[PDB]
């Protein structure tokens, strides 16, 4: 009864019926669901018995400042009482001292000598799924740090251990003996559609990641037909013994008089290490020839897709499996060590610290033992020079790898590239990744979920790792779910992504229900946005807003749109929907602006979400995640550029949520220079500054001009490094604190060479409204240079991250040309003295371009 309800609920939540998985009758799919159900149910059982503090670390992981004395006012209360107390504490005090102080006031008011010790409690942030615990001082917590900048007072609740336990309780659930050349039979093509004035060619390649194992073989030219017949042998120049484990056979069917039609790839060995034999029907994917990186599973739409039949020949009378790790380590155990001169050792040091020539690859390979012992972080370059088309060479390389020491997270993220398709090399990358903290993992999760699209099989090390970490952290679980869920309309990933979400759901029944409440809210938002789109092409904005409001006031709407966790942040609770405050934006897609309030949270419960359907939001999220990382990298070096890292989350097909930043308007709106306002100006250059002055009276203007200066320097650098163009007054926002930030991200990474942009209006604010202010202007250039030089020292981080994102399917992130842009913007080739001089030329060039509006 409950088993059937859970399954149908999973089916609705994931957006694919579980019955569809069974109907494939695929043993690989059937082993994944059994082995991952068990693995996720064990994680669940482990969780239902965690300690109470241990339960907070799962459900409410700490939100700490990248870094993690002074008077501070905090307001504390208890769960079963409306009565609060306001204490004067210090930012250097640990939450525990606040707790002991909170109980002291309760001891007098209630006159009893309180049995409770501070240790017995946790401090909940008012009307939020956020907690303050652990031995970190108050300023170290993101909520107190945010509170300290906005002047506003922290509002906390005392939560007893027994109450947290009550929450845990209610949330309960031999190959090497076959030297003949690898060949195949190309039998026939089916349902192909092309010009009859042309001929059909079949191109095949044997790959190990991005590298060829041998040269490509083309079929004979056959006349264009819907059912073309070949019945021909395609011999490759590689022996069946030399075929690596991660060898993938790639096909590109096309038309010639080069006209791309379709493509298809398959792994030569199955998920049980067996070399494949017998007839194979490859349901081809459409082109725009040979695509190594493309998925190794067939096209689901079997009725429309082209279906090339091939025939893997019987290389032996019995089945053939890839030799086990014991046979590999035995063959690779044999060889000669690196005995070379100081001169070749000096050249080896020069190339390993530094793309290399053939002879330079020959020295990396001969000196592989010196690489293992004296250059372990050079592992990726050694894996690159290895000949993956020679069984002896792979075995030597694998033998070194099993004895290879663990590498930093930085080196491990590089090893996840499609360049390293070897499962033992990938298992190795995951072993060096396990030391990632939850915060580091959250930072790179977007890229790790993309790496899943490179994976040759369902049951892989990266899936178990992502699953295990997601079941031990509710925030990780949340974002993993939404990154998978959002790509369910993509037929190439839907089976993989649907299977991972089903596994997770088996491990968190309670969270499956929480996320369905989010899914139901997004369901109603799409129907409401659809209404608005139709209504805005028929009536006036006041009329459409009122009708949107009437629709929202319905029982079904009021209930679905209310009392939920935010998909943008599970800490944020969207309680009561303020219908009167809701509206829509006037852009093509008519985005909805949805407001919420919460009495339990006060001012902190006054939140909003923007719902946008019709436009792709994956590039906006990636841009924002990159900027957020910059802010993290800067803060770690003690540079706080006053950034606004707001939420952006794609949820479905051209659908997603953007976080509302209140007390912010666009440069364009402020610059309208409307009459009967506190910001009305004598000169349009005054407007932004008058607005700033109106919002920040007295001594407050100085801090606002400084928030402006700091954020501006950060965004000038962020948009320059990331090449974010189409920047105008309508997509630049200013907060009432003076903080500047960017919205609506179309183009990024040139698509060319977007220059460093300095705008006179912002230079006018930095210079405090004065024509000349070298003091303030050069303090600004210093912030810019400092920011730029910090990013450069983390150049490989961005490069390793952007390389993993190539799997994403973003048209503006599809080749080496895009990654080159980063290398160029960060002047990754030059020394810091050289890069700084290059940055100062582009900065001065940008000031000279800003001086066009200064002159006029
Ligand atoms: C409801 C009314 C009283 N408002 C409407 C909004 N404007 C300001 C405004 C105009 N555009 C945005 C905005 C726009 C977007 C946005 C919109 C479209 C694509 C995007 N990609 C990344 C951000 C983004 C996100 C935002 N978060 N917080 C504010 C925004 O805010 C103030 C008055």
From Swiss-Prot:
GO terms for molecular function: 1-phosphatidylinositol-3-kinase activity; 1-phosphatidylinositol-4,5-bisphosphate 3-kinase activity; ATP binding. Abundantly expressed in adult mouse spleen as well as in testis. Isoform 1 is expressed in spleen and lung (at protein level). Isoform 1 is expressed predominantly in leukocytes. Pathway: Phospholipid metabolism; phosphatidylinositol phosphate biosynthesis. Residues 69-160 form the PI3K-RBD domain. GO terms for cellular component: cytosol. Its EC number is 2.7.1.137, 2.7.1.153. Residues 578-851 form the PI3K/PI4K catalytic domain. Keywords: Adaptive immunity, ATP-binding, Chemotaxis, Cytoplasm, Differentiation, Immunity, Inflammatory response, Innate immunity, Kinase, Lipid metabolism, Nucleotide-binding, Phosphoprotein, Transferase. SUPFAM superfamilies: ARM repeat, C2 domain (Calcium/lipid-binding domain, CaLB), Protein kinase-like (PK-like), Ubiquitin-like. Residues 742-759 are annotated as: Activation loop. Its main location: cytoplasm. It is found in: Cytoplasm. This is Phosphatidylinositol 4,5-bisphosphate 3-kinase catalytic subunit delta isoform. Residues 723-731 are annotated as: Catalytic loop. It catalyses: a 1,2-diacyl-sn-glycero-3-phospho-(1D-myo-inositol-4,5-bisphosphate) + ATP = a 1,2-diacyl-sn-glycero-3-phospho-(1D-myo-inositol-3,4,5-trisphosphate) + ADP + H(+); a 1,2-diacyl-sn-glycero-3-phospho-(1D-myo-inositol) + ATP = a 1,2-diacyl-sn-glycero-3-phospho-(1D-myo-inositol-3-phosphate) + ADP + H(+); 1-octadecanoyl-2-(5Z,8Z,11Z,14Z)-eicosatetraenoyl-sn-glycero-3-phospho-1D-myo-inositol 4,5-bisphosphate + ATP = 1-octadecanoyl-2-(5Z,8Z,11Z,14Z-eicosatetraenoyl)-sn-glycero-3-phospho-(1D-myo-inositol 3,4,5-triphosphate) + ADP + H(+). Residues 178-313 form the C2 PI3K-type domain. Belongs to the PI3/PI4-kinase family. Disruption phenotype: Null mutants are viable and fertile but display defective adaptive and innate immune responses due to signaling defects in multiple cell types including B-, T- and mast and natural killer cells. It is an enzyme of class 2 (transferase). Activated by growth factors and cytokine receptors through a tyrosine-kinase-dependent mechanism. Activated by RAS. IC87114 inhibits lipid kinase activity and is selective in cells at doses up to 5-10 uM. Among other effects, IC87114 reduces allergic responses, prevents the recruitment of antigen-specific T cells into target tissue, and affects natural killer cell chemotaxis. GO terms for biological process: adaptive immune response; B cell activation; B cell homeostasis; cell differentiation; cell surface receptor signaling pathway; chemotaxis; defense response to fungus; homeostasis of number of cells. Phosphoinositide-3-kinase (PI3K) phosphorylates phosphatidylinositol (PI) and its phosphorylated derivatives at position 3 of the inositol ring to produce 3-phosphoinositides. Uses ATP and PtdIns(4,5)P2 (phosphatidylinositol 4,5-bisphosphate) to generate phosphatidylinositol 3,4,5-trisphosphate (PIP3). PIP3 plays a key role by recruiting PH domain-containing proteins to the membrane, including AKT1 and PDPK1, activating signaling cascades involved in cell growth, survival, proliferation, motility and morphology. Mediates immune responses. Residues 333-507 form the PIK helical domain.
């Amino acid at each position: 009864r409950v088993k059937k309800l859970i399954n149908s609920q999973i089916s609705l939540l994931i957006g694919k019926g579980l019955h569809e998985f069974d109907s494939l009758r695929d043993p690989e799919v059937n082993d994944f669901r059994t082995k991952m159900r068990q693995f996720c149910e064990e994680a669940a059982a482990h969780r239902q018995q965690l300690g109470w503090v241990e339960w907070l670390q799962y459900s409410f992981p700490l939100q700490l400042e990248p870094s993690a004395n002074r008077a501070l006012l905090v307001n504390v209360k208890f769960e079963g009482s409306e009565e609060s107390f306001t204490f004067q504490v210090s930012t250097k005090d640990m939450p525990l001292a606040l707790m002991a102080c909170a109980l002291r006031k309760k001891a007098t008011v209630f006159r009893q000598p309180l049995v409770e010790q501070p240790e017995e409690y946790a401090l909940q942030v008012n009307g939020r799924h956020e907690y303050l615990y652990g031995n970190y001082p108050l300023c170290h917590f993101q909520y107190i740090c945010s509170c300290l900048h906005s002047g506003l007072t922290p509002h906390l609740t005392m939560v007893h251990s027994s109450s947290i336990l009550a929450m845990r309780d209610e949330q309960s659930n031999s190959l090497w003996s076959l030297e003949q050349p690898f060949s195949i039979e190309l039998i026939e093509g089916r349902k192909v559609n092309a010009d009859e004035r042309m001929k059909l060619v079949v191109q095949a390649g044997l790959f190990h990641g991005n590298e060829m194992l041998c040269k490509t073989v083309s079929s004979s030219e056959v006349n264009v037909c819907s059912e073309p017949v070949w019945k021909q042998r395609l011999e490759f120049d590689i022996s069946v013994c030399d075929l690596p484990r991660m060898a993938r056979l790639c096909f590109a069917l096309y038309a010639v008089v080069d006209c791309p039609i379709a493509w298809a790839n398959l792994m030569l060995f199955d998920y049980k290490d067996q070399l494949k034999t017998g007839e194979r029907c490859l349901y081809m994917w459409p082109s725009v020839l040979l695509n190594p990186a493309g998925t190794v599973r067939g096209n689901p739409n079997t009725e429309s897709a082209a279906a090339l039949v091939i025939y893997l020949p019987e290389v032996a009378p019995h089945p053939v499996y890839f030799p086990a790790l014991e046979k590999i380590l035995e063959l690779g155990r044999h060889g000669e060590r690196g005995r070379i001169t100081e001169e070749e050792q000096l050249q080896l040091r020069e190339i390993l610290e530094r793309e290399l020539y053939e002879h330079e690859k020959d020295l990396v390979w001969k000196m592989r033992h010196e690489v293992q012992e004296h250059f372990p972080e050079a592992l990726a370059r050694l894996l690159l020079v290895t000949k993956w088309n020679k069984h002896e060479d792979v075995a030597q390389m694998l033998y070194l790898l099993c004895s290879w020491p663990e590498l930093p997270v930085l080196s491990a993220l590089e090893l996840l590239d499609f360049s390293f398709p070897d499962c033992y090399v990938g298992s190795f990358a995951i072993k060096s990744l396990r030391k990632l903290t939850d915060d580091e993992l959250f930072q790179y999760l977007l890229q790790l979920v993309q790496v899943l699209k490179y994976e040759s099989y369902l049951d892989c090390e990266l899936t178990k790792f992502l699953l295990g970490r997601a079941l031990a952290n509710r925030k990780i679980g949340h974002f993993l779910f939404w990154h998978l869920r959002s790509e369910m309309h993509v037929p190439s990933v839907a089976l993989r992504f649907g299977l991972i979400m089903e596994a997770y759901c088996r491990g968190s029944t309670h969270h499956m229900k929480v996320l369905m409440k989010q899914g139901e809210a997004l369901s109603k938002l799409k129907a409401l946005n659809d209404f608005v789109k139709v209504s805005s092409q028929k009536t006036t904005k006041p009329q459409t807003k009122e009708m949107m409001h009437m629709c929202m006031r319905q029982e079904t709407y009021m209930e679905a749109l209310s009392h939920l966790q935010s998909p943008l942040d599970p800490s944020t609770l969207l309680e009561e929907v303020c219908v009167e405050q809701c509206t829509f934006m006037d852009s093509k897609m008519k985005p909805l602006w949805i407001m919420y309030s919460s009495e339990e949270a006060g001012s902190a419960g006054n939140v909003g979400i923007i719902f946008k359907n019709g436009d792709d939001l994956r590039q906006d999220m990636l841009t924002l995640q990159m900027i957020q990382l910059m802010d993290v990298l800067w803060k770690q070096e003690g540079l706080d550029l006053r950034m606004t890292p707001y939420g952006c989350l794609p949820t479905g097909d051209r659908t997603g949520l953007i976080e509302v930043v209140l007390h912010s308007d666009t440069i364009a709106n402020i610059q309208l220079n409307k009459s009967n306002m506190a910001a009305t100006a004598a000169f349009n250059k005054d407007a932004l500054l008058n607005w700033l002055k109106s919002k920040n009276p007295g001594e407050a203007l100085d801090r606002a001009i400084e928030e402006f200066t700091l954020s501006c320097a950060g965004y000038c650098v962020a948009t320059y490094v990331l090449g974010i163009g189409d920047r105008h007054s309508d997509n630049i926002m200013i907060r009432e604190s003076g903080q500047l930030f960017h919205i609506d991200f179309g183009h990024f990474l040139g698509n060319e060479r977007v220059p460093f942009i300095l705008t006179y209006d912002f230079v006018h604010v930095i210079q405090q409204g004065k024509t000349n202010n070298s003091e303030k202007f050069e303090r600004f250039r210093g912030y810019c240079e400092r920011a730029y030089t910090i990013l450069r020292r983390h150049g490989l981080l961005f490069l390793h991250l952007f390389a993993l994102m190539r799997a994403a399917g973003l048209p503006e992130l599809s080749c080496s040309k895009d990654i080159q842009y980063l290398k160029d913007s960060l002047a990754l080739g030059k020394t810091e003295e050289e890069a700084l001089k290059h940055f100062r030329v582009k900065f001065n060039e940008a000031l000279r371009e800003s001086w066009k509006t200064k002159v006029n």
